[PDB]
């Protein structure tokens, strides 16, 4: 077919990601290619509320009813298990920059790389033995189980705290006092960007955590963190990023990115690049490269959401083998996937922000673990 | 109308409930006095959230008045949204919901309540907490929010992912370095029993099983060890209405009703009989007022049904779980929980618990 149409699912607080989505379609459509574009790319997108699972399913069905060849979307802890299961039976590849699933789910392509390995290698590098682990239920229990798996082999004094339920900010002040009784100077934060910032604000008010302390923020949106007031007290801060600003392709992309009009592209000017928005663009790069390979193979690409009728099997299976076949050098390093859709062959840029200085500490890849230069 | 049909949904490992759901209708269909009852059964997959929607929309197209069934944690999120939006009342002996939702009548009473008073009767302050990723975070949060109010140091363990039966022993051998002997288990029977299977650690230990299916738990294996075990039951053997069911339930056709003589009457299979008793009186209350009762499974056009949810949540009937009344959300009220103590000393009935009366030991 001349025009491949893909499904879009965008929840709340993904405003910039939507702008990153619309632009990623335009730069491919504007060709210009005898070879880079053999087909045109369209999309129909439905904004939704995640908590209500009914709203999640009907959006998916309305997209499938249209006959889309791929679906790009988002999920929380609640909507995760539903969307992965619907794609597993209807055989439709689900592209997402949301947190990687603990289970070996099929027809799910996970753009966000796993931090699971990057943390443990650095905790072995820093040789931490007595530290605190603060976490929410949002990112998943993979990392909550991951450290308990290996920490007992190295005997580490780790203390866990669930904060996803805590709404009161006074509760955030009393949780830290408990660790000072256990003489804790080292902290590992595993929350979403928006949450991480709120307890760092509590560090300012209680005060004197400035010096001798160490905060490791297990989140890829390190730029979107308010680090300012913590820096000037004497704290050692280790953070994680996938995006490298030295990359000429990213700088090539940014020169165009700041130009976009607000009425057509929200949060493009006012807000800085969120890591999820960068993955949104790189998600298109995978879809584009997979479908270019599809007419390279010259394959005629193959409804209703009903269990009883019996879903077709000749459909769907063919796209997965070619989507997870890709090796595209994009903004987020090297984009490759395993059999389950998880990322592999990715470089994680490690940043050390210390009172004395602020610099890139090193890089992380699965083979060489952590390299500190 | 002279006949009302209620939708039926069943998961895996629910055979005892299947026949108990069947037999309760056969009792009702023999009268003896107002309207005929019908039911449709769908056998679904728990983990897969695809078959749940399929079996639900198949039940709804038939447009059954009230849907009965069970939910796994991966499927509970499916029915809670669907029953609320398509306005169809749900009846369940499965775990109570954590969040405040509408259009479901939860037969299973509150497990959370009894624990908060019974731990103070024993003066417990340091214990181990083994929880599941099945019944929800409601019980774990009830511990966590109360641990700061009464100053208790506890170790809550995520044993839900433990599939291989070797990790258990590695957790217990760490517990004796922290030299604590008290235990609080909040898991399902198929995983509760395996803990007691993987029990040196018998003399001077107290286990607390936070599950209403006390009978089906294999504990006599650990009882000779002399370990103390506290259990909870809503099924009352002293109740004359319970034995009346059992006398016909046991001496029942095995071909039509499997697991009738194969296994003891579980609380899930007990709550299923009471689930018909809630439906029967709610629809007879609708008969008192004559309330007239009246497709696709898509939300575009949208889509009545507030009719029955209103009457199901008000009922006051005596079943096999004794008192059955409902809160706005569908949770039990004015109910009574029996607590059992198993001791090397003796085996006995410690007392009862209700929301108003706290704990009573006679």
Phi–psi pair at B360, nearest 5 degrees: -125, 120
Q: Which of A62, A82, A308 sits opposite B77 (nearest CB)?
A: A82
Q: Which of these, A195, A247, A221, A251, lies nearest to A16 by C-alpha position?
A: A221
Instruction: Kindly state the tokens that stand for A9.
Output: 């699912």
Among chain B residues, the shortest Cα distance to A141 is held by B158
Is residue B307 within 8 Å of B282, Cβ to Cβ? no
Cβ contacts of residue B200 below 8 Å, gap of 6+?
none
For A245, the 3-state DSSP assignment is coil
Q: Which of A58, A165, A307 sits opposite B54 (nearest CB)?
A: A307
Cα A118 to Cα A113: distance, rounded to the nearest angstrom: 10
Using the structure block, give the residue that is written with the tokens 């639900």: B56
Name beta bridge partners: A43: A6
For A64, the 3-state DSSP assignment is helix
Q: Concatenate the DSSP letters of all residues of A254-303 into one string.
A: HHHHTT--TTTSTTSSSSPPPHHHHHHHHHHHHHHHHHHHHTTTT-----
Is residue B66 within 8 Å of B308, Cβ to Cβ? yes
CB contact under 8 A, A89 and B55: no
Residue B74 half-sphere exposure, CB side, CA atoms within 13 Å? 18
Contact with chain A for residue B84, Cβ under 8 A: yes
Q: Concatenate the DSSP letters of all residues of B267-294 into one string.
A: HHHHHHHHHHHHHHHHHHHHHHTT----
Stated in angstroms to one decimal place, the resolution of this structure is: 4.2
Identify all chain B residues contacting A145, using CB atoms and an 8 Å cutoff: 158, 161
CA B244 from centroid of its chain's CA atoms: 22
Other beta carbons within 10 angstroms of residue B263's beta carbon come to 13
CB contact under 8 A, A55 and B158: no
Q: What was the experiment behind these coordinates?
A: X-ray
CB contact under 8 A, A53 and B81: yes
Q: Which of B51, B82, B158 sits opposite A54 (nearest CB)?
A: B82
Containing B83, the helix (H) or strand (E) segment is helix B76-85
Is residue B89 within 8 Å of B31, Cβ to Cβ? no
Cα A362 to Cα A236: distance, rounded to the nearest angstrom: 15
Identify all chain A residues contacting B81, using CB atoms and an 8 Å cutoff: 52-55
Question: To the nearest whole angstrom, how far is the Cα of A353 from the nearest Cα of chain B?
Answer: 34
- Taking each helix axis as running N to C, give the angle between helix B15-29 and helix B240-249, from 0 to 180 degrees, rounded to the nearest 10: 100
Q: Is A243 exposed, middle or buried (0-12, 13-18, 19+ CB in 10 A)?
A: buried
Question: To the nearest whole angstrom, how far is the Cα of B285 from the nearest Cα of chain A?
Answer: 31
Q: Is B302 exposed, middle or buried (0-12, 13-18, 19+ CB in 10 A)?
A: exposed
- Taking each helix axis as running N to C, give the angle between helix A193-206 and helix A171-181, from 0 to 180 degrees, rounded to the nearest 10: 70
Instruction: Kindly state the tokens that stand for A108.
Output: 């799910």
Contact with chain B for residue A54, Cβ under 8 A: yes
Cβ contacts of residue B209 below 8 Å, gap of 6+?
B185, B192, B217, B219, B229, B230, B231, B232
- Taking each helix axis as running N to C, give the angle between helix A53-66 and helix B76-85, from 0 to 180 degrees, rounded to the nearest 10: 90
Using the structure block, give the residue that is written with the tokens 């299979």: B269
CB contact under 8 A, A82 and B49: yes
Is residue B138 within 8 Å of B362, Cβ to Cβ? no
Phi–psi pair at A362, nearest 5 degrees: 175, -170
Identify all chain B residues contacting A149, using CB atoms and an 8 Å cutoff: none
Other beta carbons within 10 angstroms of residue B277's beta carbon come to 21
Name beta bridge partners: B334: none
Domains of chain A: 1-113+246-345 (3.40.50.2300), 114-245+346-373 (3.40.50.2300)
Contact with chain B for residue A52, Cβ under 8 A: yes
Identify all chain A residues contacting B78, using CB atoms and an 8 Å cutoff: 53, 82
CB contact under 8 A, B299 and A145: no
Instruction: Kindly state the tokens that stand for A270.
Output: 């006012």
CB contact under 8 A, A165 and B82: no
Instruction: Kindly state the tokens that stand for B111.
Output: 């497990």
CB contact under 8 A, B50 and A162: no
Q: Which of these, B122, B97, B101, lies nearest to B110 by C-alpha position?
A: B97
Instruction: Kindly state the tokens that stand for A210.
Output: 């400035």
Contact with chain B for residue A81, Cβ under 8 A: yes
* Rg, chain B, Cα only: 21
* Rg, chain A, Cα only: 22
Is residue B249 within 8 Å of B20, Cβ to Cβ? yes
Q: Which of B50, B78, B300 sits opposite A89 (nearest CB)?
A: B50
Q: Which of these, B9, B1, B162, lies nearest to B71 by C-alpha position?
A: B9
Alpha carbon separation from A102 to A37, A72, A93, A114, A142 (Å, rounded): 36, 20, 18, 10, 6
CB contact under 8 A, A307 and B77: no
Instruction: Determine the residue among B54, B77, B170, B172 to mutate to test chain A binding: the one whose Cβ has the most chain A Cβ atoms within 10 Å.
Output: B77
Among chain A residues, the shortest Cα distance to B99 is held by A51
Cα A286 to Cα A290: distance, rounded to the nearest angstrom: 6
Question: To the nearest whole angstrom, how far is the Cα of B192 from the nearest Cα of chain A?
Answer: 21
Q: Concatenate the DSSP letters of all residues of A345-356 into one string.
A: S-PEEEEEE-SS
Buried b (16+ CB within 10 A) or exposed e, A62-84: bbbeeebbbbbbbbebebbbbbb
Contact with chain B for residue A313, Cβ under 8 A: no
CB contact under 8 A, B158 and A165: no
Cα A237 to Cα B123: distance, rounded to the nearest angstrom: 44
Judging by DSSP bridges, how do beta strands A369-371 and A358-365 pair with one another? antiparallel
Contact with chain B for residue A141, Cβ under 8 A: yes
Contact with chain A for residue B215, Cβ under 8 A: no
């Amino acid at each position: 077919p001349n025009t491949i149409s893909i499904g879009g699912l965008f929840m709340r607080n993904t405003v910039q990601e939507h702008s990153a989505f619309r632009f990623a379609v335009q730069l491919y459509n504007t060709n210009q290619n005898t070879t880079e574009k053999p087909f045109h790319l369209n999309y129909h997108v439905d904004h939704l509320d995640s908590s209500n699972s009914f709203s999640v399913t009907n959006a998916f069905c309305s997209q499938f009813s249209r006959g889309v060849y791929a679906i790009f979307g988002f999920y929380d802890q609640m909507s995760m298990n539903t969307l992965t299961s619907f794609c597993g039976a209807l055989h439709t590849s689900f592209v997402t920059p949301s947190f990687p699933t603990d289970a070996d789910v099929q027809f799910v392509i996970q753009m966000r790389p796993a931090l699971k390995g990057a943390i443990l290698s650095l905790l072995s590098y820093y040789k931490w033995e007595k530290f605190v682990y603060l976490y929410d239920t949002e990112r998943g229990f993979s990392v909550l189980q991951a450290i308990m798996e290996a920490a007992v082999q190295n005997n580490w004094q780790v203390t866990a705290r669930s904060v996803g339920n805590i709404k009161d900010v006074q509760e955030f002040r009393r949780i830290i006092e408990e660790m000072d009784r256990r003489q804790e100077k080292r902290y590992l934060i595993d929350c979403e960007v928006e949450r991480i910032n709120t307890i760092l604000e509590q560090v300012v008010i209680l005060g004197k955590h400035s010096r001798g302390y160490h905060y490791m923020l297990a989140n890829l949106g390190f730029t979107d963190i308010l680090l300012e007031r913590v820096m000037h007290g004497g704290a050692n801060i280790t953070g994680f990023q996938i995006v490298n600003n030295e990359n000429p392709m990213v700088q090539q992309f940014i020169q165009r990115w700041v130009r976009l009009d607000e009425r057509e592209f929200p949060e493009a000017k006012n807000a800085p690049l969120k890591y999820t928005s960068a993955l949104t663009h790189d998600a298109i790069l995978v879809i584009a490269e997979a479908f270019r390979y599809l007419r390279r193979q010259r394959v005629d690409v193959s409804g209703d959401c009903l269990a009883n009728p019996a879903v077709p099997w000749s459909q769907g299976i063919d796209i997965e083998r070619a989507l997870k076949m890709v090796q595209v050098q994009g903004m987020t390093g090297n984009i490759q996937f395993d059999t389950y859709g998880r990322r592999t062959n990715y470089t994680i840029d490690v940043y050390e922000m210390k009172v004395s200085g602020s610099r890139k500490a090193g890089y992380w890849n699965e083979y060489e673990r952590f390299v500190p230069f």
